[PDB]
Amino acid sequence: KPRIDMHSHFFPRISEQEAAKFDANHAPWLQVSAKGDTGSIMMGKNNFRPVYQALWDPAFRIEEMDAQGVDVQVTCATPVMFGYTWEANKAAQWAERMNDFALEFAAHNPQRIKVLAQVPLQDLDLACKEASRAVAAGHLGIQIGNHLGDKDLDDATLEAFLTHCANEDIPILVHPWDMMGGQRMKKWMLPWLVAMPAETQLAILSLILSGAFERIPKSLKICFGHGGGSFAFLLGAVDNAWRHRDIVREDCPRPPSEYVDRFFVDSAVFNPGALELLVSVMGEDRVMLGSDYPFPLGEQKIGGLVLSSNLGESAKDKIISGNASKFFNIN
Amino acid sequence: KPRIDMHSHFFPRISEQEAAKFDANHAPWLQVSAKGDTGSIMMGKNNFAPVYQALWDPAFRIEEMDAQGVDVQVTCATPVMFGYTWEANKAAQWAERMNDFALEFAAHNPQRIKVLAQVPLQDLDLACKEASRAVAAGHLGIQIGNHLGDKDLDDATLEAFLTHCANEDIPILVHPWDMMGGQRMKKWMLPWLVAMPAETQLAILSLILSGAFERIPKSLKICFGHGGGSFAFLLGRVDNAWRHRDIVREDCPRPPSEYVDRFFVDSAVFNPGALELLVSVMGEDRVMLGSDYPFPLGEQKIGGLVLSSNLGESAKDKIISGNASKFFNIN
Ligand SMILES: [Mg+2]
Ligand SMILES: [Zn+2]
Ligand SMILES: [Zn+2]
Numbered sequence: 001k002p003r004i005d006m007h008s009h010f011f012p013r014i015s016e017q018e019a020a021k022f023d024a025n026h027a028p029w030l031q032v033s034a035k036g037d038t039g040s041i042m043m044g045k046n047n048f049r050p051v052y053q054a055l056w057d058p059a060f061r062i063e064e065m066d067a068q069g070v071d072v073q074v075t076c077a078t079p080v081m082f083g084y085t086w087e088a089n090k091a092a093q094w095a096e097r098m099n100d101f102a103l104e105f106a107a108h109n110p111q112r113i114k115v116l117a118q119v120p121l122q123d124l125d126l127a128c129k130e131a132s133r134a135v136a137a138g139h140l141g142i143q144i145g146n147h148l149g150d151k152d153l154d155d156a157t158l159e160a161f162l163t164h165c166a167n168e169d170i171p172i173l174v175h176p177w178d179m180m181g182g183q184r185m186k187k188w189m190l191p192w193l194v195a196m197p198a199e200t201q202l203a204i205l206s207l208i209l210s211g212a213f214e215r216i217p218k219s220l221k222i223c224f225g226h227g228g229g230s231f232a233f234l235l236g237a238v239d240n241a242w243r244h245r246d247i248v249r250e251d252c253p254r255p256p257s258e259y260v261d262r263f264f265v266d267s268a269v270f271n272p273g274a275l276e277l278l279v280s281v282m283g284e285d286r287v288m289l290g291s292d293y294p295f296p297l298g299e300q301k302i303g304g305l306v307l308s309s310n311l312g313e314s315a316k317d318k319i320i321s322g323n324a325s326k327f328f329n330i331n
Numbered sequence: 332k333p334r335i336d337m338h339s340h341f342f343p344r345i346s347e348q349e350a351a352k353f354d355a356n357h358a359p360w361l362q363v364s365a366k367g368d369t370g371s372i373m374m375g376k377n378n379f380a381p382v383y384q385a386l387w388d389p390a391f392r393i394e395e396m397d398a399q400g401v402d403v404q405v406t407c408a409t410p411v412m413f414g415y416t417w418e419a420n421k422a423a424q425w426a427e428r429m430n431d432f433a434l435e436f437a438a439h440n441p442q443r444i445k446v447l448a449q450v451p452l453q454d455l456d457l458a459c460k461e462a463s464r465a466v467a468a469g470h471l472g473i474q475i476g477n478h479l480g481d482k483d484l485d486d487a488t489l490e491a492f493l494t495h496c497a498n499e500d501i502p503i504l505v506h507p508w509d510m511m512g513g514q515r516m517k518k519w520m521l522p523w524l525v526a527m528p529a530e531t532q533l534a535i536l537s538l539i540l541s542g543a544f545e546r547i548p549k550s551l552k553i554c555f556g557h558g559g560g561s562f563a564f565l566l567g568r569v570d571n572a573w574r575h576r577d578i579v580r581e582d583c584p585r586p587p588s589e590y591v592d593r594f595f596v597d598s599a600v601f602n603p604g605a606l607e608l609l610v611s612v613m614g615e616d617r618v619m620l621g622s623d624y625p626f627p628l629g630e631q632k633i634g635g636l637v638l639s640s641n642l643g644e645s646a647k648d649k650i651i652s653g654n655a656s657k658f659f660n661i662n
Contacts, residue, residue, distance in 0.1 A: 147515075150513075150514045150515050152515060154518075180511060180512050180513075180515065181511055182511070182513070183483065184482075184483040184484060184511070184533075185533065187540070187541075187578075187581075188536075188540040188541075188578065188579050188581070188582070188583070189572055189576060189578060189579050190533065190536065190537070190540070192572065193536060193565065193568060193569050193572060194529055194532055194533045194536065194565075195529070197529075197561060197565050197568070198525055198526070198528075198529040198561070201525055202512075202515070202516070202521065202525045205519075205521065205524060205525065206521075209518070209519040209521070210518075210519075230528065230529075230561035230564055230565060232564070233561055233563070233564035233565075233600075233605050233608070234524065234525075234528055234561060234564075234605075235602065236600055236601035236602025236605050237524060237528070237557075237600070237601050237602075237628075238524050239601070239602075240601045240628060241520055241523065241524060241628055244627050244628060244631070245520060245627055245628065247518075247519060247520060248519050248520050250519070251519070252519075269564075269567055269568065270567035270568045270570070270571040271566065271567025271568075271570075273567075273608050273611055273612075274564055274565075274567050274608070277564070277604050277605070277608055280604055281604075296575050296576060297571060297572055297575055297576065300575075
């Protein structure tokens with residue numbers, strides 16, 4: 001009966017000089033403060049984001065998992081580490097380094113800390129090879145971003161990557177990143193509050209409305225971060241549009257709502273009413289507890305929303321433990 | 332029991348020659364064949380959008396307004412005719428003609444057909460003037476886009492406009508508009524399924540998080556089309572960000588969910604569970620029935636979702652009739 005948190009991030013102890021070998025301007029590295037409890041992710045000499053010790057220190061993180069009652073945590077790259085815009089070979093070298101750091105991180109306690117790998121998604125062949133290598137080395141799966149430039153998950157290269165993972169039984173976490181919006185939402189974390197949930201919805205609907213689920217084998221295990229964004233709530237509008245407009249029907253032979261049996265979401269929706277709607281749509285078997293630890297906005301009391309919701313008790317057990325154990329093959 | 336549909340659209344019987352004298356390539360106009368059961372919207376010479384014989388032709392619309400149960404319908408400009416792109420004075424002239432066209436459309440039966448006006452929002456002074464003129468001419472309020480051609484949608488200019496309307500007791504309908512994802516979302520009406528609900532959420536949160544509601548008189552009567560987009564579902568996440576991040580509180584002194592009393596939304600969410608959540612969040616007094624008639628993706632059975640819901644009887648009557656009666660002053 002382990003409590004499993006399946007959505008968390010880490011960041012490796014990369015030096016500025018090491019990151020500079022890759023890209024002096026866009027390779028992230030970690031600056032740690034003099035007393036070592038806090039620090040910053042950096043890009044070149046630029047500050048990118050304030051972080052604290054649990055992000056990079058596995059001993060310290062374990063102490064916090066104990067205090068939250070978390071038995072097993074699955075953790076993966078912070079998305080700034082993805083490097084999807086880099087030259088493909090350099091990005092492949094980088095993913096392999098990051099993936100080794102991840103394994104070093106988990107080696108502190110591989111029974112309680114599990115890792116997912118990143119891949120150089122901009123090159124299909126290298127991405128597939130790294131997926132297979134990383135999992136063979138001990139990763140439980142892969143986390144990828146939800147798009148590559150103007151390429152959404154319906155794109156043939158991404159669908160091909162997902163098919164490779166399906167065929168090799170490699171679970172996938174899709175994480176929103178590099179949000180759309182452009183110039184008009186700089187303040188008040190609007191990209192996180194508006195663009196992020198729409199990115200995730202868009203990734204899900206791209207697979208659905210392109211007919212990708214008809215082509216990708218049922219063995220694919222794929223989870224979308226952050227509750228599937230606004231997917232669950234806007235699904236009604238999607239089924240209606242499918243029903244009453246031909247161009248929505250063109251590549252998708254069944255009503256969109258039925259494809260919920262082909263994917264998973266985590267539970268980070270920050271409201272009991274929202275979570276009850278999510279589970280209504282997805283089913284209790286397809287929602288997994290995820291917290292976004294250890295980021296500032298990443299659930300204070302992990303599992304707290306799920307326990308306080310009016311969901312049935314067996315649903316609560318599935319979401320907290322059952323579904324993730326099966327999805328990531330955690331014994 | 333009355334039945335008021337406050338979300339619908341019309342397009343005037345403009346000719347090719349009239350539109351050309353504004354802009355022969357950018358001023359939309361209506362082409363009806365010979366047998367007047369079909370018709371089509373043109374942008375110049377090219378075809379913009381095929382269209383139903385109810386968008387124009389009020390007599391037909393009344394027949395369809397009797398077919399369901401719609402006693403009164405509020406109708407307003409198709410977004411195509413906004414001209415927010417155009418030069419200010421030419422847009423001022425254009426909104427004038429469109430608004431007069433509107434009254435002439437409602438002239439068929441002013442008791443059952445009410446109109447809202449459009450304004451030249453790219454110029455504050457001209458916008459206020461047309462808002463005032465159009466209302467004194469019989470318009471029940473104003474429809475604006477959440478946006479402005481291809482624009483950044485939060486500033487003091489439009490805050491200025493909202494205050495004018497509140498002090499003149501002119502109701503406002505905010506209507507989602509030209510999408511954000513640029514070169515993405517080319518297929519399956521993804522712009523309407525993803526970007527539009529996100530645009531509406533963005534309009535709402537930009538008001539809230541800018542602290543605009545702290546300086547706009549409480550007399551403001553404002554409503555957001557299509558359920559407020561994904562606002563209701565994602566409000567948990569927005570409250571979480573406000574509570575845990577300094578930059579989200581910079582200009583907004585109360586939690587964001589506190590401001591639901593400063594605005595209204597329509598009920599167009601096409602799903603029972605989504606409607607219940609929307610109602611839980613906004614209150615029975617702040618949701619109004621709207622159908623998006625006569626567009627293909629409008630509600631098939633106008634009011635069907637609300638009526639077949641498990642909401643209170645008082646709730647059903649406010650949503651279906653009471654709230655709009657008060658909002659638009661309709662008897
Ligand atoms: Mg392309
Ligand atoms: Zn995350
Ligand atoms: Zn509309």
